[PDB]
Amino acid sequence: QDVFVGSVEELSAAHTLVMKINATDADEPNTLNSKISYRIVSLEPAYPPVFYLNKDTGEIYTTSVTLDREEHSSYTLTVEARDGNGEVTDKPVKQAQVQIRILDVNDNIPV
Amino acid sequence: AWITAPVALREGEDLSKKNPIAKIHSDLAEERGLKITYKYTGKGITEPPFGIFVFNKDTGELNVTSILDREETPFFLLTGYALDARGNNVEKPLELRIKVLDINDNEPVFT
């Protein structure tokens, strides 16, 4: 799909599951030529790395860097999907946007 | 080191051709064949408000995304850093401030 969508709470833990993505390829099935892997080519704000992408699965996890809803209430990522054994040249490929929406927690005290 | 006054930019103009508004670079790395990866920090990059700045990890450069407004903010305060592929902060930090300059784009209001 062109856009993928996910959510997560603030003040959460590492390796906490956010959402899944997928892609497909036209070489023969069960070959290194169609063996899909994933990567974050865009994030906003780009530093630090707050998310992790299992190349095993296309599952988006958190990293050890904690999100805050009082900082940002959403994050937009772009992701790129690759195969085989060669490496990235200047010629692009099709990429897809990810959208991670933040959930509040009760870290602020009624008075 | 040298205590600096900031780079100035002005409100209400396009900054496309005024970028980059900071840049880290080192030809002592070049003479040695060394590579470096960068980070920046502070306003717009790791702290609020946001929607103002972005930075390049490969090239050391810092950009401006938008048009400034001086009745939003007079100034901004950041820190750039340089680090190697084994985690080592390679040189003294880029201590770095930006100043926002003011023109008559509003008319007075009564009390």
Residue of B20, B15, B16, B30 lying closest to B94 (CA atoms): B20
* Cα distance between residue B61 and residue B38, in whole Å: 9
* Beta-carbon contacts of residue A45 (< 8 Å; ≥ 6 apart): A72, B44, B45, B46, B50, B54
The pairing of beta strand B7-10 with beta strand B94-101? parallel
Strands A95-103 and A3-9: parallel
Chain A residues near residue B38 by CB distance under 8 angstroms: none
Cβ-contact A15, A54 below 8 angstroms: no
What's this structure's resolution in Å?
26.0
Give the distance, in angstroms, between the CA of residue A56 and the centroid of all CA atoms in the same chain: 13
**How far is it, in rounded angstroms, from Cα B32 to Cα B87?**
19
- How far apart CA A111 and CA A87 sit, in angstroms, is 57
If you ran DSSP here, which 8-state letter would residue A48 be given? S
Q: Do A47 and B48 touch (CB under 8 A)?
A: no
Whether residue A72 lies within 8 A of chain B, CB to CB, comes out as: yes
Closest by CA position to A62, among listed A24, A3, A103: A103
